[PDB]
Symmetry: C2
Subunit: 472 residues, 2 copies
């Protein structure tokens, strides 16, 4: 009974994940084609690059509001309440399922810096519940509420793992965020179904020829023999500690912005009268600020989240690219190197700007997640630190008559994992980044940074999901 | 309060682990030097190779019996009772600590196919309790029993992780074995202290020049680009399923032997009269059967557990060593290639003999673990399967106009993980083997084999620790 239920849940989750990924990729390539095909005039290019994300955000917000307003938000605090004994039956419905799926698809295809983890884990739970009622017609044994709660808890892990194609990190993330006491039996079911879902997703990706074989999503090519030196340990630790502040600060601003949205009476009146205007206005602002030929030259705004994260994990040193740039094709990293701004300045601008863009975008009444923007911004911070350290040591570190060149990609991974843990207060972030990159050679630096960031963040601020549950 | 307690626990655990490893290595190298220095006559070499392990086993058994008979056994089921609410105060004493440490040192230096995880996690519990009692003189807040239990649970993860120098795998393994409901707060403390345990252990290893840098214990060098092909998926799955039987069978035979050891009145009377004779007799038998110039030529008896496990993880194809063996130094793998027996025959003999050897050695009244023998035998099984598959496909598998050679090392890793999971009924074993090897390229086949083996084993037989708690 249970095992076949997990198998079916994993199969349908893999299918849904694949179709959503295909849809968002199609929307992204359509946006890129529209932007590139209107390069004859800057005005028309700006008009298209503005109207497209605005249209998708307004459509998603309107569809979610009309069909099911409960689909608004991440939904992770909602399932925290569900697993804490508060049964909100309204959230687990077919209408909310369709509304949330379409809204998240449009939001991710609009190019907005948003994540999928929250809406996708919500869809995981909703699909598990719908399959529970579907199997209830063939037998009343599924009518037990305790078994339904167990399947919901397992499906949370399944969805979080299928988000990253990381069955271990996803289940650990679900255990950390959705519960405080977890049974190993529920761990077994959750990890089993997440494994099957990841397997089917990878098989579908290979079948579509998106990936040559079953491999990692964010492949890194760091040195395995000597990935890091001992003298690199303390700076890595700093990367954690500052990231913790970057976490504790972030959960602050978001909690403030919503309060500014809620406490202000004029803003509330405008929202109640013109609820579709606010997402349109903020999307206009962010699209104007990330216009590639405008300010986007200082932020590499022509890249979406996936390719930006891939570039931030590059193993080459950008600062020294100016001498051996004659025998290779033009790589994506060139987008981070405008002729007028240095690499460090571009990284600093990207950090300082994407920080508040993500902070404001997390407040939008659309189904979206926050783990992806935090991961990207932490990867940028780690890349900045790694490039600075490589500049300080141009020829690397000397150890035992050997010279090891500093790889900024390891620092970027360290920073991304540390800041994700600091924002979320979850330990699996290291496991998730390890399974995404496919290399665990940097296990100790990533782990130390994650622990330090999580500790300092917990000392300063509660988690983002706790902030949401306390504000909502 | 808590955090500094974890830091000190990790520091002392790393020191104890390092000194234990140094002592075991010294005993092993002394045994090897004694065996090699008496090559002038086979009789004297046999006499030394017999007496030395017998002497260490008898000394360990006698010291454990005289100082603290409670140190006998693995210690994992007893702490399962401890965390289940049965407080056995007699186990957590200084005398039991000393007896168990010295017995572990002697037993693992005797060359016996035994493991340390159980007795070592028992050391973890005892040292955490002793540190609590020591610092309780400085403050009363620690005579609370609930927090004592929390730190005991954390020390469980600490010890399990420090055994493998794997911060994530150790904690997850501890959660699987020692508890059914675990708090994320306890997970945080245990994982924190285990992480710093591994950090200090690796720092000490680098300082002693044992390892060049902070790296994995069982380094693999598999191809990272394309580690495996899809056509390898079903056979890998078979590797799991059979391993599950190999698990369910193993927990059977052990539970039988002790039962035969318990029900038989004559053997029991001999044990009360001659309790030191039985370990001596079994050590004599196993030393005779693993005599290198005798039967050891068919079992590679010159190699202890560590180098045997390293060799089983070799990326080279042994069947094809016979043509390119002129331009390399003599590798350890040559110990598996006698002139009279093929690789497959030697692997089958090693499997069939070491299986019952570990089954009998697990019953000895000395502090020992079973994860190491199971891991080694599963690695041998996986290596056999990989070599057979490579023989079936001499030039590898063809995919997309490319030809990829099959690496038996990945199969060995898969088999070891699957059989360890089948014996222990723990999913985490994949994480432990991943952190030991340092490569997660074969991640999906490893988890598929582990889940299949765990499922079939759980359907067939309960876990080894449950067998111990039901027999003891």
């Amino acid at each position: 009974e249970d095992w076949i239920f997990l198998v079916l849940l994993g199969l349908l989750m893999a299918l849904v994940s694949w179709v959503m990924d295909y849809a968002i990729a199609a929307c992204l390539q359509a946006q890129q084609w529209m932007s590139r095909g209107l390069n004859t005039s800057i005005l028309l290019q700006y008009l298209a690059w503005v109207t497209y994300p605005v249209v998708l955000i307004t459509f998603s917000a309107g569809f979610t509001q009309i069909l099911a307003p409960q689909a608004v938000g991440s939904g992770i605090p909602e399932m925290k309440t569900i697993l804490r004994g508060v049964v909100l039956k309204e959230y687990l419905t077919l209408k909310t399922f369709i509304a949330k799926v379409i809204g998240l698809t449009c939001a991710l295809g609009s190019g907005m810096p948003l994540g999928k983890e929250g809406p996708f884990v919500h869809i995981a739970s909703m699909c598990a519940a719908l399959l529970s009622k579907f199997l209830s017609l063939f037998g009343g044994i599924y009518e037990n509420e305790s078994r339904n709660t167990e399947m919901l808890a397992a499906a949370c892990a399944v969805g979080v793992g299928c988000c990253f194609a990381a069955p271990i990190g996803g289940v650990l993330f679900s255990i950390e965020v959705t519960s405080t006491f977890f049974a190993v039996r529920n761990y077994w079911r959750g990890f089993f179904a997440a494994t099957f879902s990841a397997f089917i997703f990878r098989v579908l990706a290979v079948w579509n020829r998106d990936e040559e074989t079953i491999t990692a999503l964010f492949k890194t090519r760091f040195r395995l023999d000597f990935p890091f030196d001992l003298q690199e340990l303390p700076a890595f630790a700093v990367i954690g500690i500052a990231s913790g502040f970057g976490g504790a600060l972030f959960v602050y601003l978001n909690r403030k912005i919503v309060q500014v949205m809620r406490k202000q009476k004029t803003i509330n009146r405008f929202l109640m009268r013109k609820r579709l205007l606010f997402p349109a206005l903020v999307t206009l602002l962010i699209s104007t600020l990330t216009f590639p030929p405008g300010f986007g030259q200082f932020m590499a705004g022509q890249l979406s989240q996936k390719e930006t994260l891939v570039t931030l994990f590059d193993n080459r040193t950008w600062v020294r690219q100016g001498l051996v740039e004659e025998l290779e094709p033009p790589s994506t990293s060139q987008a981070w190197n405008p002729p007028r701004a240095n690499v460090f300045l571009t990284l600093v601008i990207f950090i300082l700007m994407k920080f508040w863009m993500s902070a404001l975008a997390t407040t939008i009444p659309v189904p979206c997640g926050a783990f992806m923007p935090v991961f990207v911004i932490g990867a940028a911070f780690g890349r900045l630190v790694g490039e600075s350290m490589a500049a300080w040591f141009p020829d690397g570190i000397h150890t035992d008559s050997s010279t090891y060149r500093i790889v900024p990609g390891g620092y970027a991974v360290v920073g991304a994992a540390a800041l994700a843990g600091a924002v979320t207060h979850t330990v699996s972030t290291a496991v998730i980044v390890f399974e995404l990159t496919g290399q665990i050679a940097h296990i100790l630096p990533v782990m130390i940074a994650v622990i330090l960031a999580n500790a300092v963040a917990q000392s300063l601020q509660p988690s983002l999901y706790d902030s949401i549950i306390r504000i909502k």
